[PDB]
Amino acid sequence: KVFERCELARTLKRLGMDGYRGISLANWMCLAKWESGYNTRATNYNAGDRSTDYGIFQINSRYWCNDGKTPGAVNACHLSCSALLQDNIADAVACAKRVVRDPQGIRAWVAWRNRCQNRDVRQYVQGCGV
Ligand SMILES: CCCO[C@@H]1O[C@@H]([C@H](O)CO)[C@H](O[C@H]2O[C@H](CO)[C@H](O)[C@H](O[C@@H]3O[C@@H]([C@H](O)CO)[C@H](O[C@H]4O[C@H](CO)[C@H](O)[C@H](O)[C@H]4O)[C@H]3O)[C@H]2O)[C@H]1O
Numbered sequence: 001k002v003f004e005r006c007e008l009a010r011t012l013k014r015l016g017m018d019g020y021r022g023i024s025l026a027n028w029m030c031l032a033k034w035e036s037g038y039n040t041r042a043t044n045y046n047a048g049d050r051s052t053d054y055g056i057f058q059i060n061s062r063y064w065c066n067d068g069k070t071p072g073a074v075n076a077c078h079l080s081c082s083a084l085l086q087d088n089i090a091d092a093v094a095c096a097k098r099v100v101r102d103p104q105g106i107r108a109w110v111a112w113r114n115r116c117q118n119r120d121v122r123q124y125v126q127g128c129g130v
């Protein structure tokens with residue numbers, strides 16, 4: 001599914017993302033916007049390294065979920081990558097929380113560094129009731 005902005009913001013808030021390991025809801029929204037356009041079914045094969053990015057946060061198969069076809073990969077979220085393509089984003093949120101338990105936090109996603117870090121991210125949550 002493709003979420004509408006404020007629908008996603010409320011969804012993420014209910015799932016406990018606001019302030020998770022210091023990351024405001026607006027930062028998660030900016031991340032989802034730029035990675036997938038709020039689209040849970042999105043995929044992107046990385047021909048450079050044979051991994052694939054999955055779902056609304058474009059979580060990558062080398063460390064985070066198992067797709068079987070990524071060489072030398074691990075599955076830290078304990079999920080099939082299929083779980084990251086559901087309309088219900090609970091498993092994607094649990095996995096995003098796992099990603100940010102590692103040292104680099106929200107910086108794990110270069111898109112967040114490019115498009116969200118040190119920016120005014122307030123617009124992503126304006127008017128959503130969060
Ligand atoms: C085996 C010895 C080290 O193992 C440790 O355990 C890893 C995890 O905690 C899971 O068990 C640790 O991972 C951390 O260090 C490794 C070193 O290779 C990586 O730097 C991890 O970061 C991830 O690696 C990136 C690429 O897969 C490889 O460069 C990931 O970025 C990609 O996925 C992101 C989230 O989906 C995002 O999509 C980025 O845009 C992608 O490029 C990054 O998450 C690091 O946490 C390891 O120490």
Ligand SMILES: [Cl-]
Pocket residue numbers: 024027
């Ligand atoms: Cl911030």
Ligand SMILES: [Cl-]
Pocket residue numbers: 086087088
């Ligand atoms: Cl679903």
Ligand SMILES: [Cl-]
Pocket residue numbers: 117118
């Ligand atoms: Cl920062």
Ligand code: NA
Pocket residue numbers: 126127128129
């Ligand atoms: Na409003």
